[PDB]
Write a protein that binds this ligand. Structure first.
Ligand code: FES
Length: 95
């Protein structure tokens, strides 16, 4: 399956198509957007986003604690979409 991912950045709002087996960051880069990252391995907060609608599979994330997850934080570099979703990007500073 493929999902529509709406991305709300500090510049504005976009929507990209992202397969269920593509990470959200990778999908965003393919489209041509410039979202933040460092490790690309789920071990930092560089790529942090906040999901407001929809769901992901971020099973390989290892940086966010349970409360940060509850609040909607996602590590876009290891997050696959599992539905159409909306993710506010550039959220590291929240952490
Ligand atoms: S860039 Fe480090 S967790 Fe995504």
């Amino acid at each position: 399956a493929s999902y529509t991912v709406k991305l709300i950045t500090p510049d504005g709002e976009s929507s990209i198509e992202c397969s269920d087996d593509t990470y959200i960051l990778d999908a965003a880069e393919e489209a041509g957007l410039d979202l933040p990252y460092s490790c690309r391995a789920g071990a930092c907060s560089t790529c942090a986003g906040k999901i407001t609608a929809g769901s992901v599979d971020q099973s390989d994330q290892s940086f966010l604690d349970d409360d940060q997850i509850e609040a909607g934080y996602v590590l876009t570099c290891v997050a696959y979409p599992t539905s159409d979703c909306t993710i506010e990007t550039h959220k590291e500073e929240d952490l």
